[PDB]
Amino acid sequence: AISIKTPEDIEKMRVAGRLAAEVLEMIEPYVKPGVSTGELDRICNDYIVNEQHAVSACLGYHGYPKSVCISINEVVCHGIPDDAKLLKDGDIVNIDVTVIKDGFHGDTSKMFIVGKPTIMGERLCRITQESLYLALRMVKPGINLREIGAAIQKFVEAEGFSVVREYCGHGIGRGFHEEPQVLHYDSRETNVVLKPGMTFTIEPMVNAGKKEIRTMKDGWTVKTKDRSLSAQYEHTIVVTDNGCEILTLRKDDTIPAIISHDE
Ligand SMILES: N=C1N=NC(N)=C1/N=N/c1ccccc1C(F)(F)F
Ligand SMILES: [Co+2]
Ligand SMILES: [Co+2]
Ligand code: NA
């Protein structure tokens, strides 16, 4: 029961996506060594609310206590903005912003690397993003979700990394999570054939080591089961008549906003 967004609806996604991508533009300057994840959440929430005049879709969603998730190193997802957590040299850092504005969600996230990169997180972060872009490039009317998922996996495995299975991109709209599920791997289960006007996310979680994850005592923080690094990027898109438009693109992104397969 995939909604097909209207024109007016799609225009609201664009706004909401820009909003969400703008939070992540805003925050980069403040992503330095010595800063606290607790501090960043403070910063993004103030902005979301006061400046952007939007709400976090994070906050109180299943009891989520903070306004953005911010995962570090071997934290895979849903890390908790913690006033005592500080960023060190060498850290790979995901911050996931999801925003509602005028009743539509925008949902995006990115890796920041902090101070002096290391070769390994410099790399895992690169593949992770290329595995998103690869997939972004496949989206068009009549392709199957299954193809996309299979493709992300191969890319990712060929580099000696694994795709986290527990999480998936998703339908998005008036709801955070809508059909379809966007698995980032192959499944006889998946058989979705895309149509002009579906909105959804692509957001592969990629581990440097093995694909097994583990939730912490706090009920929230997911880690690598082998403490290997993990990394994620996410975008929201609309399928178009000839391809896709990416609705949460940033100035720092290197793929076009509009993507066409037509002649
Ligand atoms: N699937 C997701 N893509 N972006 C997000 N923020 C996603 N999920 N967030 C979840 C999922 C379950 C429970 C709580 C959250 C929260 F709060 F981080 F948003
Ligand atoms: Co997100
Ligand atoms: Co998402
Ligand atoms: Na991580």
Where along the chain do its domains lie?
1-263
Task: Give strand ranges (E) for 133-253.
Answer: 162-163, 169-171, 178-182, 199-202, 205-207, 213-215, 222-224, 230-232, 235-239, 243-246
Q: Which two structure tokens, joined as six digits, stand for 209?
A: 């080591």
CA 191 to chain centre: 22
Q: Which two structure tokens, joined as six digits, stand for 177?
A: 């999570």
The reply to whether ligand 1 has any atom less than 6 angstroms from the CB of 170 is yes
CA 217/CA 214 separation, integer angstroms:
10
**Among candidates 207, 223, 117, 212, which has minimal Cα distance to 159?**
207
**Among candidates 129, 134, 130, 140, which has minimal Cα distance to 260?**
140
In this structure, how many other beta carbons lie within 10 angstroms of the beta carbon of residue 255?
A: 15
Q: Which two structure tokens, joined as six digits, stand for 200?
A: 């959804």
**Among candidates 179, 196, 184, 187, which has minimal Cα distance to 156?**
184
Ligand nearest to the CA of 168: 1
The residue assigned the tokens 């054939």 is 193
Query: By CB neighbour count within 10 A (0-12 exposed, 13-18 middle, 19+ buried), where does 254 fall?
Result: exposed
CA 64/CA 179 separation, integer angstroms:
22
Q: Which two structure tokens, joined as six digits, stand for 190?
A: 């998946």
Q: Which two structure tokens, joined as six digits, stand for 2?
A: 């995939």
Question: What are the CA-CA distances from residue 242 to residues 142, 194, 224, 239, 263 (Å)?
Answer: 10, 11, 38, 8, 10
The residue assigned the tokens 């991109």 is 169
Return the ligand 1 atom nearest residue 177 CA.
1
Contact 192, 164 (CB under 8 A): no
The residue assigned the tokens 């006061």 is 50
Sheet holding 222-224, edge to edge: 75-77, 222-224, 213-215
Distance 103 CA to ligand 1 centre (A): 18
Give 75's strand partners. Answer: 223
Amino acid (one-letter) located at 226 = D
| Reported CATH class of domain 1-263 | alpha beta
**Structure-determination technique:** X-ray
Among 176, 202, 234, residue to substitute to test ligand 1 (most atoms within 8 Å of Cβ): 176
CA 256/CA 30 separation, integer angstroms:
26
**Among candidates 17, 9, 231, which has minimal Cα distance to 107?**
17
Crossing angle of helices 37-46/7-27, nearest 10°? Answer: 140
In this structure, how many other beta carbons lie within 10 angstroms of the beta carbon of residue 117?
A: 15
CA 122/CA 118 separation, integer angstroms:
6
Contact 13, 108 (CB under 8 A): no
The reply to whether ligand 1 has any atom less than 6 angstroms from the CB of 64 is yes
String of DSSP letters for 134-159? HHHHH-STT-BHHHHHHHHHHHHHTT
Q: Which residues are annotated as a binding site for substrate?
A: 78, 98, 177
Contact 103, 174 (CB under 8 A): yes
CA 14 to chain centre: 16
